[PDB]
Ligand binder design. Structure first.
Ligand SMILES: Nc1nc2c(c(=O)[nH]1)N[C@H]1C(S)=C(S)[C@@H](COP(=O)(O)OP(=O)(O)OC[C@H]3O[C@@H](n4cnc5c(=O)[nH]c(N)nc54)[C@H](O)[C@@H]3O)O[C@H]1N2
Ligand SMILES: Nc1nc2c(c(=O)[nH]1)N[C@H]1C(S)=C(S)[C@@H](COP(=O)(O)OP(=O)(O)OC[C@H]3O[C@@H](n4cnc5c(=O)[nH]c(N)nc54)[C@H](O)[C@@H]3O)O[C@H]1N2
Ligand code: SF4
Ligand code: SF4
Ligand code: SF4
Ligand code: SF4
Ligand SMILES: [S]
Ligand SMILES: [W+6]
Lengths: 970, 214
């Protein structure tokens, strides 16, 4: 045999890095220490087939790392050293700091006299790197403590995707999945570097090319992705909407739209109301005083029943499709070329290749991530591509869709569990102060009087009731509703999000912060503020694998430990391969993974840390009383625990949900204790509990569907690679969302050779049908109120059509599309300065990743093999800019912005060229954000020293992809 | 014997192969710095049996040709390294007659390493300056003998790395070359009749690396 593996037990796992969700094989030494001896790919996994990129292939070095935390550490106020302490001391004292802060800050009623039952004195950050069961438990622990300031990776990552696609299609998630990429006829990779940041995805991209697909990369830089594509086009950072607006105009002029799809399945035919207008960069209903729009001005014209009027002939001048044609008339090739820096020839080449998928039996897909999301127009960037895809009929089809490439292994999951300030688990909103009763909460859901509109959100009362039964099983839902904290109706939602949490922290408004599996000292935009602001905390709890720039912010650059009062608790956690649970990948595949090695040293799984912490808080309240104890005392944690520890299996079964009594639902009858077989069988009357209605169907009486390793497929399924028996995906194992839009009104595939679903005899074969009903009887977008793909989307903060605005720091002084330079409602912090055509900062600044490092590099800067390949922060510049500034390849340079400066190694490359903007050459400076002051030696610090704390008015995502900088030789 | 077919028309320079080699053998990391390139380690060494070389070629239009070369021992059918080592001491360099693997033993310490490196037309051998042992890719002969793929072959996501019997790999190489030419008209196979690691280059192999072919 092989000596190395001869005395080791084999277990399956799922990669702890990106949301591809590659399968691992872990080899663990059979007895003694019980450490991992080998980690490599799972050859039987249907996504990676045993392949791993360098991050996955090096998990052994991460897991069996001699720099990992071993035991809890305590930093007393003003101290310059850590003190090793017991878990008993660490958790006991943290429980006291929570209780003390909660008791002193707890608010029953706000200024307006409305019940809010919250503490605004504690914030939490993290984490998409925790298991789905841990993320769900964590959120409910925090909410039982009365927290509203609850955030994680999603805010500063794909937060714009959720409303962008929900507005467009009804859901915020990636529409298709990785395997499906192989079915595409044209793959547009734009605002994405998928060959570096989702590497196993290129298995399926290249299989698409094997079958005749055109591969297009549109990126300011020529990357490792660009090297394998058929068409490469440059684009200036922040010029996406002009490029996409130009493609809309191109599709409409040349009649490359899928007419029948557009007419039947989009809101093309809907009559917009008389109060809608746009002139000179501003929509109707603009309120300049309050920096917001009166969205009521964008309402549709309704019939007597309240159903939006439709002209099926598409001739009415206020038809969505005619207002669309009129809006994007301004986006001619000359104007788009002049503002993007992309030649008219390159625009035409991309436009022609992509818009060819307007043909019914041809599928085009978009792969995008942070190059689109991390902007002041992040939501509108994505809206524009959603609209393009609806025009070409690419939504719901194999090789089509909007593939929003999620980041972390479980960021899909962590968003699903409501680790954001505006959402409970399952995208049920956090109540505002005016939602005084469960009844009023439920009243907010719009109804539809259209007999073809499923309007599936009408079932929300069942999900909210079943969620409240999961947490508070002995209370009536309408009673337990009063246990959970509410946000103020009077405020912009962005008041409760990441950037404003750091602004409030900088003004002393926070006593306590959980940095739970995040490194905000490096990952948060405008990092110098974040590093100062954490100085204003009385206490900080950091839960992570290694000591880091957040845990040890107090001994960071230019900091005096003697002057910093912050009490810090470092709690070392287990790595992915040392624990059991599920992680939801980009395609919503919820995959179960197992324990290989025992926990390293005295490290603990997050599940156990948060549960023992909460138990100490609960027992403190049971002894000495305090502020509104009921939500803490009454929380059902019995169902989270087995053999004195966190039970991923039991939690997963509660998240699926079970009957609290004998129940009759949907014609069937259920015994008390049975698992809910799907969210179809949840009730509003208290008969059912379910931690997350999306998980209903994931863990039934049949067993853990997330643990299925079945690659068998029907011939229909196998033609497109659904793999519906491999793990489980929400909702109810629908692998391609909106798949009713992939067939005509009789149920016949547009592309029978790549059918997603087909009506045969009297049933849908292939994928699970997304919305029940015979062919032609239902609008295909069942999560939309009206049932249509929204070309016109009036729910978005800065308008129902995307419109070009320049980045808040931009290299141009005049918008060629209007007299509005910037997003007229952009999230900004008053007094914070922006370099708009400032000669001190004349270069475009952008930040991005390399294949070999992960996030802030907290994990990968500890891994010698990844440091080997990418040892130091670098600065990528053109030969033209290198010559202008007298920088040679390999020289030390200083990159500076209004907010900070750092040193990096110049990489002078032909892979970057000037952007000719209005006939003038504009230079860019590119930086990886993977480096931090702690490790390694000469590695450098975070690119987030330079980035602005401003961005998207929908989601508050920072504009980390387009700002302004200077670069000087050192 | 066994053969690799390395189709560089599919290489994303992910360096999965470079890490997988080191994880499988538990090889140490070099002390590296950025000198104006993503390439690192900059060269093969006694502790690096495979590195991915990065080369930028000028192209008139917006982009470039970015040429990626995951370098390893070619495990030559008639290896000159063996011919040269065998003048000083047979057993320093031996051949697995089942797999085709060319294997350096710890006896390379007691031969002219300088001369053995010079014998290689692909400049593959590297010397440990302390022990004077020669080290290079060993075809993961370990894994192949136990019916497993080499670590770098299994880890490769793109279909660049292929491995199996010489007849199936030569057949694959000819079929793939014809397909690749539709996109890369200047595509060629590296010394296909002389080695067991057959690279498909998308253009002039010497643009990938000066010793890409003999
Ligand atoms: N290797 C690696 N993989 C990762 C991660 C990692 O750290 N390293 N992290 C994971 C996470 S959390 C996420 S969210 C994803 C993100 O994955 P990506 O979004 O691919 O990541 P980035 O490299 O930040 O940005 C992608 C590309 O956007 C380009 N770009 C910059 N500005 C603009 C612009 O204004 N417009 C357009 N169109 N493009 C622009 C950059 O040049 C870059 O090539 O990756 C995930 N996977
Ligand atoms: N300038 C710039 N800034 C960016 C970005 C950008 O492109 N440019 N990208 C943004 C994006 S998309 C994201 S997602 C954020 C990420 O920002 P952060 O989340 O702050 O990044 P990291 O902390 O490096 O990565 C996640 C952490 O999870 C930890 N972890 C791993 N496993 C576990 C576990 O089991 N438990 C716990 N508790 N922790 C664990 C890792 O050790 C690591 O510290 O950065 C954002 N910041
Ligand atoms: S980082 Fe992503 S692509 Fe690489 S091995 Fe892990 S899951 Fe797969
Ligand atoms: S693993 Fe495959 S794709 Fe990645 S660098 Fe190596 S040969 Fe190229
Ligand atoms: S490539 Fe060089 S070291 Fe490898 S077998 Fe051939 S001659 Fe010997
Ligand atoms: S065949 Fe084995 S020893 Fe040779 S480069 Fe690949 S992993 Fe390394
Ligand atoms: S993420
Ligand atoms: W992310």
């Amino acid at each position: 045999e092989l000596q190395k593996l001869q005395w080791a037990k084999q277990t399956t796992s799922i990669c702890c890095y990106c949301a591809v969700g590659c399968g691992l094989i872990v080899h663990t030494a059979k007895d003694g220490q019980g450490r991992a001896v080998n980690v490599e790919g799972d050859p039987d996994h249907p996504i990676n087939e045993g392949s791993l990129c360098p991050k996955g292939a090096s998990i052994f070095q991460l897991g069996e790392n001699d720099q990992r935390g071993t035991q809890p550490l305590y930093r007393a106020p003003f101290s310059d050293t850590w003190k090793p302490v017991t878990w008993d001391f660490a958790l006991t004292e943290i429980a006291k700091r929570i209780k003390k802060t909660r008791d002193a800050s707890f608010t029953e009623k706000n200024a307006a006299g409305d019940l809010v039952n919250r503490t605004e004195a504690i914030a939490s950050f993290g984490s998409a790197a925790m298991d789905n069961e841990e993320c769900w438990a964590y959120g409910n622990i925090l909410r039982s403590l009365g927290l509203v300031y609850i955030e994680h990776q999603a805010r500063i990552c794909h937060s714009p995707t959720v409303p962008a696609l929900a507005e467009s299609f009804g859901r915020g998630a990636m529409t298709n999945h990785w395997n499906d990429l192989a079915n595409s006829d044209c793959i547009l990779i734009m605002g994405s570097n998928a060959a570096e940041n989702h590497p196993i995805a290129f298995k399926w991209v290249l299989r698409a090319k094997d079958k005749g697909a055109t591969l297009i990369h549109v990126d300011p830089r020529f990357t490792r992705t660009s090297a394998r594509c058929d068409v490469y086009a440059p684009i200036r950072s922040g010029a996406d909407i002009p490029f996409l607006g130009g493609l809309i105009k191109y599709i409409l002029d040349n009649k490359l739209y899928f007419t029948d799809y557009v007419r039947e399945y989009t809101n093309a035919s809907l009559i917009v109301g008389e109060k809608f207008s746009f002139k000179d960069g501003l929509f109707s209903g603009y309120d300049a005083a309050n920096k917001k729009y009166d969205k009521s001005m964008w309402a549709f014209e309704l019939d007597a029943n309240g159903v939006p009027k439709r002209d099926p002939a598409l001739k009415h001048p206020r038809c969505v499709i005619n207002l669309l044609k009129k809006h994007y008339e301004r986006y001619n090739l000359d104007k788009v070329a002049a503002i993007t820096g992309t030649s008219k020839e390159q625009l035409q080449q991309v436009y022609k290749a992509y818009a060819a998928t307007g043909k019914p039996d041809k599928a085009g897909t978009i792969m995008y991530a942070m190059g689109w999301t991390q902007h002041s127009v992040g939501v509108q960037n994505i809206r524009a591509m959603a609209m393009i895809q609806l025009l070409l009929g690419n939504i719901g089809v194999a090789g089509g869709g909007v593939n929003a490439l999620r980041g972390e292994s479980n960021v899909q999951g962590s968003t699903d569990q409501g680790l954001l300030a505006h959402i409970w688990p399952g995208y049920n909103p956090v109540p505002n102060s005016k939602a005084a009763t469960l009844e009023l909460y439920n009243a907010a859901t719009p109804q539809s009087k259209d007999p073809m509109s499923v309007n599936w959100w009408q079932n929300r009362p069942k999900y909210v009731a079943s969620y409240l039964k999961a947490l508070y099983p002995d209370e009536e839902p309408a009673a337990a509703y009063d246990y959970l904290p509410r946000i103020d109706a009077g405020r912009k939602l962005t008041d409760y999000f990441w950037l404003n949490i750091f602004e409030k922290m900088d003004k002393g408004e926070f006593k306590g912060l959980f940095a739970w599996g995040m490194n905000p000292a490096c990952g948060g935009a405008n990092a110098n503020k974040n590093r100062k602001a954490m100085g204003k905390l009385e206490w900080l709890v950091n839960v992570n694998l290694f000591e880091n720039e957040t845990s040890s912010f107090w001994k960071g650059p230019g900091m005096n430990p003697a002057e910093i009062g912050t009490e810090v608790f470092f709690l070392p956690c287990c790595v992915s391969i040392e624990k059991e649970g599920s992680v939801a990948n980009s395609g919503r595949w919820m995959q179960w993974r197992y324990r290989g090695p025992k926990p390293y040293a005295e490290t603990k799984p997050d599940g156990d840390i948060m549960l023992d912490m909460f138990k100490k808080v609960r027992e403190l309240y049971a002894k000495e009383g305090g502020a509104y104890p009921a939500p803490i005392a009454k929380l059902n944690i019995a169902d989270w625990e087995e053999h004195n520890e966190f039970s991923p299996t039991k939690v997963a079964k509660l998240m699926n949900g079970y009957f609290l009594k004998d129940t009759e639902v949907g014609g069937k009858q259920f015994k008390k204790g049975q698992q809910v077989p799907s969210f179809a069988f949840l009730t509003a009357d208290g008969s059912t509990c379910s931690g997350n209605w999306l998980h209903a169907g994931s863990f039934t009486d049949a067993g853990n569907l997330m643990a299925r390793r079945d690659k068998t497929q029907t011939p229909e399924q196998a033609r497109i690679g659904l793999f519906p028996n491999w793990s489980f995906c929400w909702p109810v194992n629908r692998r391609i969302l909106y798949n009713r839009a992939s067939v005509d009104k009789t149920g016949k595939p547009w592309n029978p050779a790549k059918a997603v679903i087909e009506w045969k005899d009297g049933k849908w074969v292939g994928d699970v049908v997304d919305g029940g009903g015979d062919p032609g009887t239902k609008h295909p977008f069942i999560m939309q109120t009206h049932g249509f793909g929204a070309l016109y989307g009036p729910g978005r903060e800065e308008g129902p059509f995307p419109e070009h605005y320049e980045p808040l720091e931009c290299p141009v002084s005049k918008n060629p599309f209007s007299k509005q330079l910037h997003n007229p409602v952009a999230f900004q912090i008053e007094g914070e300065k922006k370099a708009v055509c400032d000669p001190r900062y004349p270069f475009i600044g952008t930040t991005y990743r390399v294949t070999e490092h992960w996030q802030t590099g907290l994990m990968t800067r500890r891994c010698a093999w990844l440091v080997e390949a990418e040892p130091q922060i670098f600065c990528e510049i053109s030969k033209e800019l290198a010559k202008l500034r007298g920088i040679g390849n390999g020289d030390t340079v200083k990159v500076s912005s209004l907010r900070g400066a750092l040193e990096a190694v110049a990489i002078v490359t032909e892979r970057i060229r000037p952007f000719k903007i209005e006939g003038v050459d504009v230079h860019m400076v590119g930086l990886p954000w993977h480096y931090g002051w702690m490790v390694p030696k000469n590695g450098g610090d975070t690119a987030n020293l330079l980035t602005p704390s401003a961005g998207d008015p929908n989601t508050g995502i920072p504009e980390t992809k387009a700002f302004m900088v200077d670069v000087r030789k050192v | 014997g066994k053969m690799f077919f390395v189709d560089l028309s599919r290489c994303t320079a992910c360096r999965g192969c470079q890490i997988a080699c080191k994880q499988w053998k538990n090889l140490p990391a070099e002390e590296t710095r950025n000198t104006g390139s993503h390439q690192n380690p900059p060269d093969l060494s006694y502790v690096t049996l495979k590195t991915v070389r990065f080369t930028e070629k000028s192209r008139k239009g917006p982009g470039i040709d970015w040429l990626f070369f995951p370098e390893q021992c070619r495990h030559c059918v008639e290896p000159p390294c063996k011919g040269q080592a065998d003048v000083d001491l047979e057993g320093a360099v031996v051949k697995d007659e089942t797999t085709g693997a060319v294997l350096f033993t710890e006896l390379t310490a007691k031969v002219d390493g300088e001369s053995v490196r010079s014998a290689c037309p692909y400049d593959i051998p590297r010397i440990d300056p302390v022990t004077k042992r020669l080290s290079k890719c060993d075809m993961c002969n370990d894994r192949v003998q136990n019916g497993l793929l080499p670590a770098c072959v299994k880890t490769c996501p793109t279909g660049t790395m292929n491995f199996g019997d010489e007849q199936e790999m030569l057949a694959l190489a000819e079929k793939r070359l014809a397909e690749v030419k539709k996109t890369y008209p200047g595509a060629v196979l590296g010394d296909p009749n002389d080695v067991r690691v057959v690279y498909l280059f998308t253009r002039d192999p010497k643009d990938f690396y000066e010793h890409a072919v003999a």
